[PDB]
Amino acid sequence: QISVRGLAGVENVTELKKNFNRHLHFTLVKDRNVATPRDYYFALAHTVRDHLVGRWIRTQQHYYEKDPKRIYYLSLEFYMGRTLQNTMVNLALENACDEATYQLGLDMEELEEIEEDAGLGNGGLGRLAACFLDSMATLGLAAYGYGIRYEFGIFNQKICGGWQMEEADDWLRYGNPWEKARPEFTLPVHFYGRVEHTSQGAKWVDTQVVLAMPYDTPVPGYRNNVVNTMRLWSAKAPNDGGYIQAVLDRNLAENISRVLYPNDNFFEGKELRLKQEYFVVAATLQDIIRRFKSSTNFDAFPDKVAIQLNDTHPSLAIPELMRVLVDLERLDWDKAWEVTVKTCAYTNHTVLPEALERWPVHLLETLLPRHLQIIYEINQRFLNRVAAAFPGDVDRLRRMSLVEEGAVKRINMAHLCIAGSHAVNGVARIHSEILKKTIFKDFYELEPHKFQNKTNGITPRRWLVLCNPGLAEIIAERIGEEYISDLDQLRKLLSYVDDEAFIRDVAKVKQENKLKFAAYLEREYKVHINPNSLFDVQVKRIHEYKRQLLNCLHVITLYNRIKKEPNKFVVPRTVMIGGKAAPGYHMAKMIIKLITAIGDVVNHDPVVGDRLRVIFLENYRVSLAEKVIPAADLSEQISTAGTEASGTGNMKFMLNGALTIGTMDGANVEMAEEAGEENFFIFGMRVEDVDRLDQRGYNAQEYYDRIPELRQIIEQLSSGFFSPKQPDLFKDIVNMLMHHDRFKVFADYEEYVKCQERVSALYKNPREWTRMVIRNIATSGKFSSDRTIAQYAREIWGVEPSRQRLPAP
């Protein structure tokens, strides 16, 4: 059908069709008389998977032969989403499969909707890991993703009575055709026990053993025949109060990989979580060393191995590597430390204090006794270095310590990561600067060379070609397909900004995507949006720092203005807000209820008509993002300046033809810089402004007293206007806004609504709105994760990316 989807060869389609029928018969064990859509989905999945194996085997065989430097990306989250379409795209099999299934009388799009999302992540951090895997394979790097195979991923969100209800994400129920279990490569992981000091070295004895069983998933590069591996570990009890009970208690050990902690940017110091963190680190490091000893002088270890820590979650890799080198390999401390530092690199994802991992000493003491001793030794030697560089600066010593004193002694994992890594990077320029100027200022002064910036990016395969084929096609028509793996080429679209044909096509694609999504909304969930309105969307995890509340205030403002002057014309809008709240985050759960409550009033007010709709997008996840983003007109990126490290959803919207209303926070700054501030809807306080307000002291009452419209809104919330049966339902929200709002919602309210008016004004001019859209798409090239990975490769890992096709399958 469309060019960018590949060729539908005669031999190819014929081959696909027979293998499809072969799997239906031999793999699913059903004949055409009783097969269901799900059976057809699996037959297709196995058929596509078959095309990967050959390339997967030779790619890995190739790394064994040439022995390049290996990149190990450790993350407790890999937010993969669906795999079928992505695999077809990267293998140039989409049109062929579409034709093959068409000839078999099946609709491939219907089959793709059957696949369960691999939701092994919470949001930004986990999706970044996923885009990175795609880019590393596309750039020909010998990269390995290592994580945990949770049998239950991020919970499925249900909305009941306007409230969020959580239910288990049993994503493996029908099986996972993409993974390959490798029970023969199971490795032991140790917990508890005690430390014995023998004649020659320390010994970790009397430990509890838990087995780590690996499941490998193929990660195909974009049309280069490279297929890397993502290895996820699963917990298994060894086989060695009653026989029955002993067998039943095996589940205690297997609970380690049972479920993903559903927290986004929040630290919950539970023992089970600590076990998960060590579990992934311990098993992964054995693979690394194993693989290294094959390719005993560990002096070349840093030349053959690079370990990237996605946040501090896998920080135990540092003392675990030291434990292995010192206790097992018997290297001297200084030698082991030199190796460790040159091998590890740490990526920070946020500056919010509640997100920082600070594990209680008593926990590490019981669970990992040897690691705590190693950590104390690292701290001791590190502080001696600070003391020597800043003689007499005693406060500096306590500020930089890995050991945090107080109520209960805690270990600051971020400090541990900085001390044990040769590189530390923020995820957006402004974020990286904030790290050097505040949170890690002391460390930056001691070792300035370690601090870097690596602005986040998103993969254009999944976030353009896959989710928005229509847009990818009209772009390809003018500049070719080369931009798919070289996004900077999108610049060339700048010379079409005045081309009447292109303007019309860009607007047509957006219109089609909106009709498509408007339909999906009714098919599933039975709603009523109007395709002609401006699609205003804010999708991301529910957080106070994200400020879904500021958006809510604007919505209520629009509603009140309409009720004040009913027969006045206003640009129609469909405001969509979606995102999950961590189960224990009370305020976040209240915000969801507020959104639905506003919708209940606004969506049934006769005077409003179809001029304003408020919809809460249920169960926001990767597959849903692939549907709503291509249909968006306005992207809401309104976090308080200095709180959103980077953001990546913002980049997805930019690449898909939506204009952005946002604060100068995270990557928004670089996006506006790339497209030009005139083509962005920037408003609100800058980081400096927030600091000034904090010096002075934030008093929300002031804004309430001087802004009539804002006062009216708070009084509506307080009096029960949005909760008739429960008049004080939103008391906590008002109380927070009025007395303890860390994110200063009121301070940006006036500038925000004024900016929104400018958005409505531009939307009334279709031609100019679209021309601004073209300028955003044309300058979104920098935000490709291929650029990001190329920078990590050259500036941190010391390896050169390659765009060379691997010697066929």
Added chain:
Amino acid sequence: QISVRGLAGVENVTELKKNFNRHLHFTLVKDRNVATPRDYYFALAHTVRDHLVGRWIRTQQHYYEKDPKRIYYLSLEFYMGRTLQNTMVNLALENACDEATYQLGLDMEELEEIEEDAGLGNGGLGRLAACFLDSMATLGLAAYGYGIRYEFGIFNQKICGGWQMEEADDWLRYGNPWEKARPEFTLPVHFYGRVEHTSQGAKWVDTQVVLAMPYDTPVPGYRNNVVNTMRLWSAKAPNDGGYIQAVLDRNLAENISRVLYPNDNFFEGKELRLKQEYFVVAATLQDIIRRFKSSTNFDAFPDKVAIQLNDTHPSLAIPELMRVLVDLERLDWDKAWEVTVKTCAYTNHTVLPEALERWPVHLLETLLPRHLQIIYEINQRFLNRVAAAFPGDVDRLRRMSLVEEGAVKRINMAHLCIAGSHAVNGVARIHSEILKKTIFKDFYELEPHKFQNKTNGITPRRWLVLCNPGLAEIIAERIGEEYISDLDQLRKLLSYVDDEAFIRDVAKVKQENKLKFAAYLEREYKVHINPNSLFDVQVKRIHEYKRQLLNCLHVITLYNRIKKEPNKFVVPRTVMIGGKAAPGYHMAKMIIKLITAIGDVVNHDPVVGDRLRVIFLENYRVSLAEKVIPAADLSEQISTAGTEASGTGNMKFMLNGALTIGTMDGANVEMAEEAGEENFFIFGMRVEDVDRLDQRGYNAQEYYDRIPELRQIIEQLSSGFFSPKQPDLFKDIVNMLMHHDRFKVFADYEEYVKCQERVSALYKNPREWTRMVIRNIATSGKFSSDRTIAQYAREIWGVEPSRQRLPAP
């Protein structure tokens, strides 16, 4: 190589080889450079499995078309063993696969040893279910086996310091290529809750729901292209104190199918066990009704459905069927009961009281409130019938009640089964008679027509062709292959009893099997047996009623006689005893220690030499039975008369060329009757003799006082002769033998040792020993499970067996 293994066609081998390589590549995802023996085993397994699917699909499709009466065999145990070789045998693919793997440079026998046994059974009862499945498919019956998919089967037995150590049987670790998960057919099962009495009928509400997910395994008939199904249910928690904990607690529901209770002929009234029993019944009955409504007048239900209860374990099927018909389908009680009785049939497996299931009322009350009410109603109406037939016989009423009064009220499941079944059968003639004369005398008098006999049998495919190809071949040479599915034809071998060539061949095969096993003993376990000695073996579960102890006494007697007259000639013997003890059965565990202790003394006594060896066969299971039975010379079947209902191991030994020393118990009686008492080594008390002794009162002291050799043995045990470091180690054993031996070991001692002397005398005459062997093999035809199933079909289920090949694959 050997005729009976099929043809090795040119096209067949070529096809097998490429599919083998296809699976290695696409299924195992490995190339020849790194594949291990286990990978090769799986490639072969998937290749063989592929040959089944076509036949499996058409067989099931066929039953849907013709709609024959369905046979449902419910059992909590299916002791399947390995599946690879059995599948090849039944598909006539053994020689082809042997050649194909040979050409690929692999040894198929080495690959077969890699397969894990499907040990979902304890012993006799579970193996019987397995042989039955094979026979039902071979006889073309539309039969379905229904059970539980335990993730942990019978424990693997390790011997440490002479003691049994149990370790988890993680048989699914590397996967099961034979099963097909069918998550789409998952069904709900209810527990707990309460009963509500509404205007029109009772309601079972507020229940806890557990999901039953089916896994289907193909059961191929012998070369008739019929492939039936064995459906095993797995417990799954539904998806609807903390979010994390809620997810973690899902395992509470999934524990239902976690492990097999390792008890053989012993009732342990644990709640988890009761849950397993209802779980299998509830899910299975929904399938049955589902399937019936397709093929609403339930009057034809008994004409389209037959439910066979393997022991009382699935007895809840009776009140569950009533619950469904009365509460859900709304049929009147009497109609529902008529249907239930005509549908259900019950098979009793033992008369020992400790094996009888008697569930406490308070347990059923809490777990299954509606079923208890139904049981009370059944009892009420049943007792009214007894009262009407035996007016005034008040003691009869309490003896026949399903409700047993006393300390704690209990429900006698055996009485429940008899009342709700149209047929009740014992498993051997003597056992069936004992049921009518004692245990169920009252029921037999009330309904004589219900009681039947169905002597057990074993499948000649697994127990002859598969485990003893050498013997199957020399038999086929003289009489053809027709006997494989018509064992009675073995009679024809009677005319070869004087044939010198046959005598020589029969003896040669036995010699080869012994050399083979003697080697296996050294490869694995490093032992020292001498292939020239008489192989005396007793393999079966360790039980006091089985009398491994009587065997031990004989062994010690032989040892003492040798020490008394060292330079006297005695027929060399290798005494092998193997079997597992239930973890909580103390005496059984002590018996294992005694056996190993005897071996420690006897196997290292210089004066004994290689004239006497005592070996304990570790981890006895189906795959091990397939190795040792073909190598046996003497089969020990020495249970106390009236305790072993049938036995099946006895039949396996007879078919494989071993002579039998045994008591007139269970099927031993019919075996001796078939071969002729002169060709059997019968000894000991008969059932009548045991009763006479019980009237009088058993006093072991008497035998101890009048038998010098017996006294010497007891004194050796008592003084620590077999346990130097622990002089009183076997005090419990001596105490039991002397004061509370329910099985009267001493009473059969003299006749047993005297009989053993006759065995040694015959063994000294190779020619005559073999001629007697031929007469046993020639008359073992009656013990084929094909005969047994044919009888169940005609006399209980009302269906005719067929030997017609299904219309090709």
